[PDB]
Amino acid sequence: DLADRFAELERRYDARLGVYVPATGTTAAIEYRADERFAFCSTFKAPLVAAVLHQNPLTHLDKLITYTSDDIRSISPVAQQHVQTGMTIGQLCDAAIRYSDGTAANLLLADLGGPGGGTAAFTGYLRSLGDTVSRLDAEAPELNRDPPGDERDTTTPHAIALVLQQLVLGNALPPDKRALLTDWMARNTTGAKRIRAGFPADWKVIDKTGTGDYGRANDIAVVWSPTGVPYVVAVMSDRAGGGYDAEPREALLAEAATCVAGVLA
């Protein structure tokens, strides 16, 4: 039994696990703690890039953004390397998705603009997709730090799966912008040990990870079977019992995804 397997994983990793896979043609929704709140961590960067793409002509990708030493406030593998030159909006989107670059995401939030350094507009974009649950309140590094149970900077597996479904499979974005987001997620460098590890090699996986304090580890993905049938997979986890410095456990997400893959095969 699937719920029993997920509960076993929670005990193994001293964790809270949330899983959602939306219903399809012939599969029922898979849900486990799917309506409980979990921190977004970096998973918000997928709809953030969608928001920025949607808001602007495609050639806004070519606009150069400059930034300074005091803008590097978080893990930023790309933005740290390019600080002496600036980065284009396209480069920022690439870094935000594929390297989970914190500075890149903060700069994209500022590009979206408005109150809260762009967080209010980001949340408004989610509202436009029918998501009345999620909320973004802070940028990096603060957004990964809210205490367990706090609702700031949270989504739910259910909510973010429905958002990702509209972005990648549905018509939230025009096809050209949809393809840009899809390709960046396809080329992600940070997800090999999460949902990807749970699906056989002949399934296509695109994803966006997130990792935070209190042992937070998330992954959101779109997967395609060897015959081209797509599923959206959201897996979220935290380890409040280990406190602020609890280690995130990717293996929990790999095992959860393996259980999901077993059902979808």
Distance of alpha carbon 148 from alpha carbon 221, whole angstroms: 24
Structural domains of the chain sorted by starting position, each given as residue range(s) with its CATH number in brackets:
1-265 (3.40.710.10)
Which residue out of 31, 42, 134, 250 is catalytically annotated? 42
42 counts as catalytic: yes
Could you give the C-alpha distances from 204 to 183, 198, 253, in angstroms and in order?
12, 12, 17
Distance of alpha carbon 20 from alpha carbon 260, whole angstroms: 10
77: exposed, middle or buried (Cβ count in 10 Å: 0-12, 13-18, 19+)? middle
Which residue out of 8, 128, 142, 151 is catalytically annotated? 142
Measure the N-to-C terminal CA separation of the chain; round to a whole number of Å: 16
User: Which distant-in-sequence residues (6+ apart) come within 8 Å of 217 by Cβ?
Assistant: 194, 209, 210, 211, 237, 238, 248, 249, 250, 252, 253
Resolution, given in Å to one decimal, reads 1.5
User: Which distant-in-sequence residues (6+ apart) come within 8 Å of 51 by Cβ?
Assistant: 112, 121, 122, 125
Could you give the C-alpha distances from 51 to 12, 178, 195, 249, 263, in angstroms and in order?
38, 11, 24, 30, 33
Q: 53 and 29 in contact (C-beta within 8 Å)?
A: no
237: exposed, middle or buried (Cβ count in 10 Å: 0-12, 13-18, 19+)? buried
Distance of alpha carbon 157 from alpha carbon 233, whole angstroms: 9
141 cis-preceded (ω within 30 degrees of 0):
yes
142 counts as catalytic: yes
Q: How was this structure determined?
A: X-ray
Backbone angles phi, psi at 42, to 5 degrees: -75, -5
Distance of alpha carbon 124 from alpha carbon 101, whole angstroms: 22
